[PDB]
Each structure stands twice: as structure tokens, then as C-alpha cells.
Write a protein that binds this ligand. Sequence first.
Ligand code: CMP
Ligand code: CMP
Lengths: 177, 172
Amino acid sequence: QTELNDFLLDVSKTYFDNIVAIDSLLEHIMIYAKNLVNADRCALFQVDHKNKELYSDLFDIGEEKEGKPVFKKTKEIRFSIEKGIAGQVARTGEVLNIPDAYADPRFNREVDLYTGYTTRNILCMPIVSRGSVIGVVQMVNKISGSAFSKTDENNFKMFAVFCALALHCANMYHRIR
Amino acid sequence: ELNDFLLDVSKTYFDNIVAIDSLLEHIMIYAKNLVNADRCALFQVDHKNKELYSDLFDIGEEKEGKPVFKKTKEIRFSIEKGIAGQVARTGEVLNIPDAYADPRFNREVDLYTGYTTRNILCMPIVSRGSVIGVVQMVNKISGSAFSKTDENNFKMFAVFCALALHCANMYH
Ligand SMILES: Nc1ncnc2c1ncn2[C@@H]1O[C@@H]2COP(=O)(O)O[C@H]2[C@H]1O
Ligand SMILES: Nc1ncnc2c1ncn2[C@@H]1O[C@@H]2COP(=O)(O)O[C@H]2[C@H]1O
């Protein structure tokens, strides 16, 4: 498959070109994941450990630059770590596939209520560093599907491990110069 | 378990040799589970002697909870031999559905270990245009052979083998 080939080429280009590949890798990971699972949107939240909140970092608003997504850089979406599918994953490190967001009692509707967007489906995974969840990535809304499929979910679990290993490798490289 | 595994993968070690070894183990254990292989191995290339030699070699053992690997350079053979040697020599990925039917397969390792190999997924580990190793997944557990999906998923994690091995090669 062309897209995977293309992504593996993008990951090595990334390590070849960058001092600290992490950000480029995470963005490439999210963009590749989005297209693979056919999600309408995605996000990266950071965990504010100090305050026990999540806040937005990258927030896809469906805006595209020449075929591939651009994300909005904004910290404005901020809420308690006790709320939402994002909160659940920030607290436990689980990778979740929620087929019906509004049916799930953990879902935090406050974001939809604010944006006017309607969230139907969520794949949610942690970003992990040094034994802690430091961040959360979501894919939102299966395009013309009723939910993210079991294949989707398994591919996303694989991306969670990919990211845990990428962060570990980055922490490890940083130690040698 | 996936959440424990992710948090455990992220756990660091101050000691550099322990760190690099633990990382490689994690990669192999996850790859093995991901494609449902019975066994796996990492070989390094000895460019001088034109040989491959084992670095990490699964023998199906367990010390606690999860797979544990033999750290042993004991398996060694000419780069002319085997599916591993073919990948070292050309850099191509191989998915071999029936090892004994492939004339490139090195049957001498099975004679030595007593194990019977049936199928092999084998990927090159490349650092700077140079194949510095090969990784293998061996013997699909609930299937006839490794699928193309298996191959693609296994390939995604190969970069982490290259990074880990480069690190050991910097820490001479
Ligand atoms: N890119 C996005 N656009 C609109 N809403 C989003 C986006 N990413 C995440 N969200 C929503 O943010 C919510 C945070 O709480 P939940 O994880 O329960 O549910 C999440 C989704 O409803
Ligand atoms: N973990 C393992 N246990 C037993 N045999 C293995 C293992 N990993 C690789 N091999 C064998 O090692 C061989 C080396 O040459 P081949 O690549 O032709 O075929 C390989 C397999 O038969």
C-alpha cells in the first residue's frame, strides 16, 4: 500500500532531517492515522499535571493545505482531568474506541457545546514519557461510517506503541552527543 | 495490560547498556505479539568477516510474566547463507511462507537448535545506507504464513531497531 510506503519514507526523512524528530513525527503520525482510520478530525491535548487539567495543543478544524491537514495551535480548550474520554485516557493510559460518544457517560459534551461540532465516534490514546501519561491524542468521527472499526482500533493501538517507543528513543538519544 | 505495557515501554534506565537492551527486548516482544510469531531474533552484520551473528534470540522461555531472550553471539554464519543473509546482502524485505521450500533458506540453524522453522518474516535494519542487522519473526502461530498486513506492521517497528542499534554503536 502506497500510503504506508509513503509514511515509512516520511519517518526516515524526519529522523534524517531533524535534531529532535518528536514533533514532526507526532504530526506525521496524526496525519497518517487520520487518513488510515478515515477520521474527520483529530487533536493532541497536553496534560497539565500541576493543575490536574488537559489543554488543547493541536486541534484540527478541517482546514487543509494542499491535500494534507493543517492543525490549529491553541491552548484554549482546557478542562479537568476528571472529565471526558480524554480525561479517562489521561488517568489510566488506556486506548479507547468509543462507538457512540453521547451514549457514553464519561464523554465531555462541553467541547461540542462550545464548537457547534457534533462528536459521534472517538479513538483515544495516551502519549507516555518516563512512566507517566503526558498527553492525549484523539481521532474524531468515522467519515461515512457509524463507528471506528475493529481494524481502526487495532491500528490505533499500534500507533500508541509506536509513539511510546518513539518518545523513549528520543529521551534516549538526547542523552548522547 | 496494553496500558501497563505502554507505561512500561516509556520507563527509562540510567544505565545506558541496560537501557538499550531493555528497549530491544520491548520491541521484539511487541513485534512477536503483533504478528503472532512463535519466535524472533535479531542478527548483526559483521562486515569484515562477511557474516551474520545472533544478538538476541528467542528460545520460547520465560523468567516471569513475559518472553525473555538469549543474549548470545553463538549463531553465526556466512552472509551467503539463509533468508537472513539474503536480506543482509540486498536490503530487501522477505516474507517466506514455507522455509524448507525456499532454496535460500539456511537449514543448518534448525539442525543446531533442534527447532523446526516453517515461515519467516525478515527485515533489514539500515543505518546510513548500510544494512547493519536483520530482524526476524518466525513461525506464525494461528495461520499458515505471515500475511502482507503482518509484514507491513512488522516494518513499522524496524526503525526502532535501527535507532536502538545505532545507539549501542555510538556507545562503543
Ligand atoms: N478536532 C476536534 N474538533 C472538535 N472537537 C474535538 C476535536 N478533537 C476533540 N474534540 C472533542 O473534544 C472532547 C474532549 O472530551 P472528550 O474526549 O469526552 O470528547 C472530545 C471531542 O468531543
Ligand atoms: N528465535 C529463533 N529460534 C529458532 N530458530 C530461529 C530463530 N530465529 C531465527 N531462526 C532460524 O535462524 C535461521 C537463520 O537463517 P534463515 O534466515 O534462512 O532461517 C532462520 C531460522 O530458521
